Design a binder for this molecule. Structure first.
Ligand SMILES: *[C@@H]1O[C@H](CO)[C@@H](O[C@@H]2O[C@H](CO)[C@@H](O[C@@H]3O[C@H](CO)[C@@H](O)[C@H](O)[C@H]3NC(C)=O)[C@H](O)[C@H]2NC(C)=O)[C@H](O)[C@H]1NC(C)=O
Ligand SMILES: *[C@H]1O[C@H](CO)[C@@H](O[C@@H]2O[C@H](CO)[C@@H](O[C@@H]3O[C@H](CO)[C@@H](O)[C@H](O)[C@H]3NC(C)=O)[C@H](O)[C@H]2NC(C)=O)[C@H](O)[C@H]1NC(C)=O
Ligand code: NAG
Ligand code: NAG
Ligand code: NAG
Ligand code: CA
Ligand code: CA
Ligand code: CA
Ligand code: CA
Ligand code: CL
Ligand code: CL
Ligand code: CL
Ligand code: CU
Ligand code: CU
Lengths: 633, 633
């Protein structure tokens, strides 16, 4: 099991090894301060593909099982963040700093994600030193400390306007013990500068209150005293062992990236591998509004972590009561492994739609079919307000469906001015702001082996004389085919035109002489790429494409980075860089899919948005890969 | 029950009345000859909407219940086809010829659909007088009358190259007891001219045999005698009463149009009507190939009948064993009513995806959700080789999903020459020819009443200085909104761009000041419109649009016609005619959706193609139609 996530035991071992080997004093990350040194996280380091295949296919010994550790080195003249490969598990003996060889240089400290202790300290500052200065205005709008509901804060990101910044607009909301505290904005937002290593030097650089901007809370309060601020009062058949799933028809290895999310490796249909890896790479949301956080937010969720933020699947609600559930173990912001109970679930679903069927007239007595049962692998990420359920469903005919379903609660903004220009009013003093939802997937298809080619097939109409009546013409329907040659030709612009039939194929043909292939059919209602003029769109440049094929490279494991979120102006990973006109004829190919939709909140979204529809994502379908409809057991 | 399809009793009554009022000159259509007079079909005549609404909403007496009869008047100097409104049911007293007032003039005789007795006679001619003339070439390729498999014919359409023609290329295939006879072409096709009223004057105007054309079968045979033709040997929670479905949340009336297919009327959510009618209008397929039938076929299925050709749903396969099944009754090509057992089925499906859910960190103890159970109304049309399952699914949040799933067997063509230019080889001597699958729906939404407006909403980015940092800009995401004014502006070109949020709205707003609305979200992978240069594309001009909104007109009940198939060059109904720049501001609006996909057959399609995916069609979703998430029972 070389693709299995590190276990509770391996997580503890690496940690012990790190404490022992790291000369600079370490602090439990759950309690670390900017200036401390701490281990931010440790998880599996995926092995090199060649070594993994030599093992899986040729029985060579397994590749050294390694872990990747992200260390925040804040206690030093020039703090940095460092990635260390530690291995070979069970008992490590080396610790390799690979930061520079993977990024060209050091990782600046302001790129590290904000720590939970950092959030807790920002909150102590806001509730103990900041808000009381505006007690008067706060009693008026919100019964602050006078029986009114408790207040709580809401993060936003990126944090600033250029590289180096760590200034975040935190919004103030009623802690209504109900469906979404973020559905009750107060209209108060604070720009706190928390870039300094000593929290004692943090400050609020600006404040936004119900439509107006102020220098600080003391100015808001004193102008309110002077009767100059109008305050609005705000009311209220298969088995699973280790990391492998096995069914009569399918077989694959599953896992969860702490930052990347759900992933699957070594997918095989009837013994034949169709893909080395299929995994989530990034999920994002771009917001609009006339209040600070709504107008500035551009999320690249791996910065928080689709794995880290994964939640327990509710039996009977998220998965069937009789589904098989599996646990996940991780070490993120703690020096002891945590286990996430019921992080995954696998079960068989009856689509209630006949898979195959045909009927006829009389004394042709042989018509019927079978129902369509599919195998589902599921997990759920809960990022602040939205819940993302990730699906990978395997069909009995060799097809795979990968989908994203968004549910949860929407984040709201205090309504004022030209608010409707940025969304819809969904309550009193509340606007539901516009945003897009995007997801990116890495699809490493190895069709009939490693060496693949990309084919673009479509239709065309060409008028031609009718043979049996030459005086008449007929718009002749036909298929068009072109073997793509370079990456540039296989980078299809979001919302643009792309071949209706696009597939990756091996050199060998099926019995009938057609290239064996697996095509990709995307399903999305994406909203329109962010203009490249944005000083930060390169950090999520995967959003420029609906689909893109490049050469699989050991040096390009991901289309995004945990480090992009707190510094999109100078991205740590710019997916578009992977597209550099290389040949895609007979190479190990990787397909990357973008899927998403536009969300203009509406009244039906309150108190919670529902999963109506079949999600967003893609299908991988066999196209002349077999010589006929494949068997089924 | 004014939307209910005519019952066996009413069907018998209308028929008795017609025999009585039309006298002796009548023959059972099951046995009629071109020159005979016969009743082709009788079914419900939908009532005027105003009268129906006055009855459903104001308790006015119901509209006269009537039937529409299509009579073939072939026994006369100038044969024609006539539509007669017969009524009031139970005991009819009048018979109104409405042909001229609905079409501007008489329906020419060659437009009538080919009768089953007509097909049977074409077959007697082919097997008794034609093929024997080529016994020698047929012995060789197919062991004709020497122990080889029986042969059978395959229809194609249109029939000719211009208005007035009734010449059809019939293909010859092995009749195999297995997975589809049309999967075994012989390479032999015959153009039979059956326009003449006396079958005795019918002739084969041309023959195609394995790549070459001939004048007739005697020429094929004698040239083969002359050792000049090389012959390839070819081997081998709710209740349903009457026509109304009732559930805790939904209520609607269902039915099946003999030619139009599944249909639903008076759809109500929590007592409020969302749509007067949602129904199938047409389904089509455009083929390509280098053999006669595949290069000429352009199907407009209503010409045969999605209702007429509907098949019994297989319990346990097409619908769950415990679903509720309903029968359908019809009079098509018979003088006695026929009943189609299990023509519909209704049941509750668990999508296996949580409808709503949210989770959190600690001591916010109130996270969970409910599973998503949906109501399904289903029926299946079996058109020759294709099986079309029509779904209408009603969600508990007010949303409706309408889909088409294609399954069954592909029609094949004998492989020769440039075959691969028109499809993929899927067997020995067999090509699976390219084709598109299209379906058109009539969606008569009455959002908050009859008077509706169309809104186009989308997103846009506009760079704006950052208030708290004026030296910096930010691509500001926002919503754009435009009230469409005329039909021309709401006719969105297939494959073109269209607003991401398009909805029909009433004059009244919801509690938050936004127009109450239902948006249409289409889901298709259509192939590209037939060029308007085609002398026949006007007959299916609905294929030009992804979506179109027009004024509901009593005079424009359907976007197609049973009579278009045998005469597309001079269509009886040209949908684009409905788009004539009228106002769409505050009128009874009707939305028409087109959905489809491209199908390049592949090996996996043999012996039968599967329904992997979620079909093609559209979603109708509430957009500020409610004041919050609707309740659920
Ligand atoms: C399509 O064919 C229809 C069937 O033949 C035509 O309709 C028929 O036209 C006849 C000729 O006008 C009518 O006959 C008349 O019937 C009355 C009342 O029954 C007799 O008293 C009259 O003598 C006779 N007219 C005369 C003196 O010739 C039929 O009543 C009528 N049948 C029906 C069922 O409508 C259509 O006219 C033809 N359509 C078009 C547009 O040409
Ligand atoms: C920022 O992050 C790391 C934390 O300081 C830096 O890595 C450390 O660099 C030190 C000096 O460059 C190394 O010290 C060496 O340790 C060995 C023991 O193996 C001593 O004998 C040497 O005298 C001492 N000096 C040198 C230069 O070798 C640390 O061992 C090393 N720690 C790790 C885990 O690598 C990174 O260099 C820095 N990042 C960047 C890119 O600048
Ligand atoms: C096909 O063969 C079966 C078996 O005899 C028979 O029922 C059928 O009528 C034959 N021809 C056609 C066109 O169905
Ligand atoms: C990529 O290379 C091809 C030749 O192989 C060239 O024609 C094309 O213009 C190049 N595109 C770019 C990105 O320069
Ligand atoms: C409506 O559109 C037609 C062409 O589509 C144009 O000729 C006409 O002037 C337009 N009239 C309107 C709606 O102003
Ligand atoms: Ca590259
Ligand atoms: Ca590959
Ligand atoms: Ca009109
Ligand atoms: Ca309407
Ligand atoms: Cl498939
Ligand atoms: Cl921006
Ligand atoms: Cl919805
Ligand atoms: Cu959203
Ligand atoms: Cu098809």
């Amino acid at each position: 099991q070389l693709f299995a996530d590190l276990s509770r035991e391996e997580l503890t071992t690496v940690m012990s090894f790190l404490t022992q080997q790291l000369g600079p004093d370490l602090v439990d990350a759950a309690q670390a301060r900017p200036s401390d040194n701490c281990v931010f996280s440790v998880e599996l380091q995926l092995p090199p593909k060649a070594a993994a295949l030599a093992h899986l296919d040729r029985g060579s010994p397994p590749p050294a099982r390694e872990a990747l550790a992200i260390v925040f080195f804040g206690g030093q003249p020039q703090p940095n963040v460092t990635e260390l490969v530690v291995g070979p598990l069970p008992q490590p003996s080396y610790m390799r700093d690979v930061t520079v060889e993977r990024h060209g240089g050091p990782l600046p400290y302001y790129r590290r994600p904000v720590l939970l202790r950092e959030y807790l300290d920002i909150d102590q500052m806001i509730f103990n030193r900041e808000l009381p200065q505006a007690a008067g205005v706060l009693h008026h709008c919100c019964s602050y400390k006078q029986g009114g509901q408790k207040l709580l804060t809401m993060n936003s990101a990126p944090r600033g306007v250029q590289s180096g910044d760590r200034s975040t607009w935190f919004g103030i909301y009623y802690n209504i013990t109900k469906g979404g505290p973020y559905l009750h904005p107060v209209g108060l937002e604070l720009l706190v500068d928390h870039k300094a290593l000593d929290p004692a030097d943090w400050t609020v650089q600006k404040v936004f209150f119900q439509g107006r901007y102020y220098e600080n809370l003391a100015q808001l309060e004193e102008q309110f005293e002077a009767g100059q601020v109008n305050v609005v009062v705000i009311p209220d058949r298969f088995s699973v062992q280790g990391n492998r799933v096995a069914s009569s028809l399918w077989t694959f290895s599953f896992g969860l990236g702490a930052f990347s999310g759900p992933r699957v490796f070594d997918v095989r249909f009837q013994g034949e591998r169709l893909a080395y890896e299929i995994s989530l790479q990034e999920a994002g949301a771009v917001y609009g509004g006339n209040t600070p956080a709504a107008m500035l937010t551009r999320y690249m969720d791996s910065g928080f972590g689709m794995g880290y933020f994964a939640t327990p699947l509710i039996r009977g609600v998220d998965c069937p009561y009789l589904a098989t559930y599996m646990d996940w173990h991780f070490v993120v912001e703690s020096q002891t492994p945590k286990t996430l109970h019921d992080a995954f679930c696998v079960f068989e679903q009856n689509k209630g739609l006949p898979l195959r069927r045909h009927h006829s007239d009389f004394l042709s007595h042989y018509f019927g079919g079978v129902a369509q049962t599919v195998l589902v692998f599921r997990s759920v990420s809960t990022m602040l307000n939205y819940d993302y359920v990730w699906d990978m469903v395997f069909y009995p005919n060799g097809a795979i469906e990968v989908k994203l379903h968004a549910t949860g609660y929407i984040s709201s903004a205090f309504l004022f001015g030209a608010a409707r220009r940025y969304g819809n009013q969904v309550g009193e003093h509340t606007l539901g702001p516009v945003h897009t939802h995007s997801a990116h997937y890495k699809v490493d298809l190895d069709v009939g082996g490693l060496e693949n080619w990309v084919w673009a097939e479509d239709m065309a109409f060409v008028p031609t004389a009718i043979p049996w009546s030459p005086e008449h013409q007929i718009q002749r329907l036909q298929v068009t085919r072109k073997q793509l040659e370079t990456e540039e030709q296989a980078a299809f612009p979001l919302g643009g035109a792309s071949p209706r039939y696009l597939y990756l194929a091996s050199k060998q043909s099926n019995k009938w002489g057609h290239p064996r292939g697996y095509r990709i059919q995307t399903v999305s209602f994406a909203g329109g790429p962010m203009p490249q003029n944005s000083p930060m769109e390169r950090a999520f440049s995967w959003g420029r494409y609906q689909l893109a094929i490049t050469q699989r490279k050991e040096t390009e494991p991901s289309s995004s980075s945990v480090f992009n979120q707190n510094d999109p102006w100078t991205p740590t990973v710019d997916f578009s860089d992977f597209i550099n006109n290389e040949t895609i004829a007979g190479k190990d190919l990787v397909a990357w899919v973008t899927a998403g939709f536009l969300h203009i909140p509406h009244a039906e979204d309150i108190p919670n948005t529902v999963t109506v529809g079949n999600g967003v994502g893609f299908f991988l379908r066999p196209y002349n890969f077999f010589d006929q409809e494949p068997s089924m057991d």
